[PDB]
Write a protein that binds this ligand. Structure first.
Ligand SMILES: CCN1CCN(C(=O)c2cc(Cn3c(=O)[nH]c(=O)c4ccccc43)ccc2F)CC1=O
Length: 351
């Protein structure tokens, strides 16, 4: 094949996110049986059906027996096969069980998209598959120069917003990509001049990124249990890098992670201290802010392309009885997100 004229950083990114064995490695981390439910048999209607059984388990938990729960728990394992041998699998009887399997199915949606791009489309041996797979993302990815002003601001955002409670690792920036998904700037047009636009982090495991770059950040479907998400079904962002970095699910056994910097149109924020499982905002509000105990210093805010970057050092917020150590931002219309950067990160675990 022609050998591909993309920059080396962009080529390594494509290999990373379209890695088939990584998708399998992620599936088994959720205790899925690849014998019964391999990567190829995975589909949206099975995932949605599973979500719905998870919604029924939510219902039985909210109204209090281990007899009826058993049947609902078993129907879930019927739809998404798990690896337990000749088993008796563990019972899904609490809110934690619901949250955990919801977060798995979230990931399965992104893996299904990644794999479907991989096995859809055309097969040309005279093209480098790196280029082939790059085109399927429908995203322009360019490497940012390490000396540029936007690189300096971004590295400072990474540097200044690592939390003391997440000090089991620290982060090096390897590559900074400027990204532009097809049609997203057009979709963002109604919110482009809205007040309170903020450049915020979103981390995910690397096996979600083909899905994210092709489909954008999305809302979990109607079938998903709204109780499974702290502030309902929306797109979640953080202003502290380490909080988002945790959702990469790096380890000593694979600490290369990817993280997004997106422009989020927050507008009039509906501020909350504790969990609230809503499927729609109250009138006049464009986002939810989960109020952190700590927050980046408001005096140290900086502008990048007319978007506030909250890159100050973490200080006290003056909020008392909150569930959240750090801030959290949720939007409930996918048109309120414009993804601007993607960072490849080097996790230095000190444990
Ligand atoms: C089905 C696709 N999907 C559902 C998962 N998703 C989210 O934004 C999302 C993400 C999380 C977890 N999470 C997360 O994965 N990354 C974060 O940076 C983050 C920051 C603050 C709070 C939660 C975070 C929890 C619920 C969610 F809905 C976007 C998304 O595209």
């Amino acid at each position: 094949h022609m050998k591909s004229k993309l920059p080396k950083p962009v080529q390594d990114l494509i290999k990373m996110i379209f890695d088939v064995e990584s998708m399998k490695k992620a599936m088994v981390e959720y205790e899925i049986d690849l014998q019964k439910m391999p990567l190829g048999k995975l589909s949206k209607r099975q995932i949605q059906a599973a979500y719905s059984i998870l919604s029924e388990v939510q219902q039985a938990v909210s109204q209090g027996s281990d007899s009826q729960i058993l049947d609902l728990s078993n129907r879930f394992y019927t739809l998404i096969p798990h690896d337990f041998g000749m088993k008796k699998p563990p019972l899904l009887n609490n809110a934690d069980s619901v949250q955990a399997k919801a977060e798995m199915l979230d990931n399965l949606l992104d893996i299904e998209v990644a794999y479907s791009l991989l096995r859809g489309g055309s097969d040309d041996s005279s093209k480098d598959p790196i280029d082939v797979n790059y085109e399927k993302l429908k995203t322009d990815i360019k490497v940012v120069d390490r000396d540029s002003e936007e690189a300096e601001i971004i590295r400072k955002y990474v540097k200044n917003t690592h939390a003391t409670t997440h000090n089991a690792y620290d982060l090096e920036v390897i590559d900074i990509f400027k990204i532009e998904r097809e049609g997203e700037c057009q979709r963002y047009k109604p919110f482009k001049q809205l007040h309170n636009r903020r450049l915020l982090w979103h981390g995910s495991r690397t096996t979600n990124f083909a899905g994210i770059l092709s489909q954008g950040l999305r809302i979990a479907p109607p079938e998903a249990p709204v109780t499974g998400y702290m502030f309902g079904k929306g797109i979640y962002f953080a202003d502290m890098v380490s909080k988002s970095a945790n959702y990469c699910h790096t380890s000593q056994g694979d600490p290369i992670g990817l993280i997004l910097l997106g422009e989020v149109a927050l507008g009039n924020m509906y501020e909350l201290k504790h969990a609230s499982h809503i499927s729609k905002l109250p009138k006049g509000k464009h986002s939810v802010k989960g109020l952190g105990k700590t927050t980046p210093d408001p005096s140290a805010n900086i502008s990048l392309d007319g978007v506030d970057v909250p890159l100050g050092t973490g200080i006290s917020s003056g909020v008392n009885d909150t569930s959240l150590l750090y801030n959290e931002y949720i939007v409930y219309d996918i048109a309120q997100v414009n993804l601007k950067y993607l960072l490849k990160l080097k996790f230095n675990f000190k444990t």
